[PDB]
Symmetry: D2
Subunit: 115 residues, 4 copies
């Protein structure tokens, strides 16, 4: 129900081994750790959560872009890329959070489908 896809606009490749942290806003308005992982050789991160665990809420997907660029010898502009959204407020959906990275720029889009 939640997938993250990361691409590299400099190399024209998947962004491999990118750390991703997901948080859910708690009743006390704090960010609770929800799930985390690293992108694969295809730039994708699957298996973060289940339909049962991925309840209504406000979620934050943090993509560790700075560590990614530093590993390639680029001192980038951003600390990270954060994507913050309400999920599953009209019932369960499938979410793909996609990011396209450059050293001084990033772009993000969502693909939301109803199973």
């Amino acid at each position: 129900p939640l997938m993250v896809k990361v691409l590299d606009a400099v190399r024209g490749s998947p962004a491999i081994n990118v750390a991703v942290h997901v948080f859910r806003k708690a009743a006390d308005d704090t960010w609770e750790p929800f799930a985390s992982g690293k992108t694969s050789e295809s730039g994708e991160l699957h298996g973060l959560t289940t339909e049962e665990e991925f309840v209504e809420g406000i979620y934050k997907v943090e993509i560790d872009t700075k560590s990614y660029w530093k590993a390639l010898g680029i001192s980038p502009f951003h600390e990270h890329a954060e994507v913050v959204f309400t999920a599953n407020d009209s019932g369960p959906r499938r979410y793909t959070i996609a990011a396209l990275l450059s050293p001084y720029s990033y772009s993000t889009t969502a693909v939301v489908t109803n199973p």
Copy 2:
């Protein structure tokens, strides 16, 4: 030293009257309010800070994209768009944070000049 520019990819226009909040990371790792305003008719927010106040540090620019889309009657995906970066005195000294908005997507770039 710090300018924010916001554009609308649906209407092909500046994003006018968008709330923007700037925070600086404190020593306790919390976000301290730093500056804020609403974008002009040109989609720009000037006069956020001075060279004296804008010291090295980690800054967050929060753009209230959700209110912007709701005001146009368009269902948006994001709660807001956040841009988090380090200001470095070794780098050039004027920072433009630009954002291009769509209902389910945003893009941001930095233009850093002397």
Copy 3:
């Protein structure tokens, strides 16, 4: 060896039924029709060409964005989105041409992999 993926930044969905025309620059410097098709329900267009047919050259991928938006009741800015690139000049590669569409904006990236 050539795949096209198109996403809609307004609806947060694949861009379905988008016409795509591919051209190859001929020896006389004209654009020769090479392949064409329409994006699927996933926003993807597969099966445009084969490793054998997809020789070295300069290729143009034309995505008919204007017809797509008009069908959704939006008068868009661009006539089309064109992606022009040299392919296979260092031997065969796999190319994904991806586009993210808004009425007054588009973004494109390439993912190039070596089988």
Copy 4:
């Protein structure tokens, strides 16, 4: 009436000294040269045309991205970036064509104002 702005997403800077060619579609469906220049130190190209010359029609803005990346020693994907659009007198009358460049990607938007 027509301005082109080009930004570099790798260096976080204006894209300086980029060749830009503008064409207008002729009645025989060929691209007629209309205007051209090189981007300034601000990444901008002004003075391409006048209100009198910039009549309704189909225009193409060609940005020589390949030469730009080659000059930086960076291997690029695209031969160039082309932006093709209709100028419409019913719409607002100033057109900014903006492009954000990376070696394997570009993004473009239109800012159309009165």
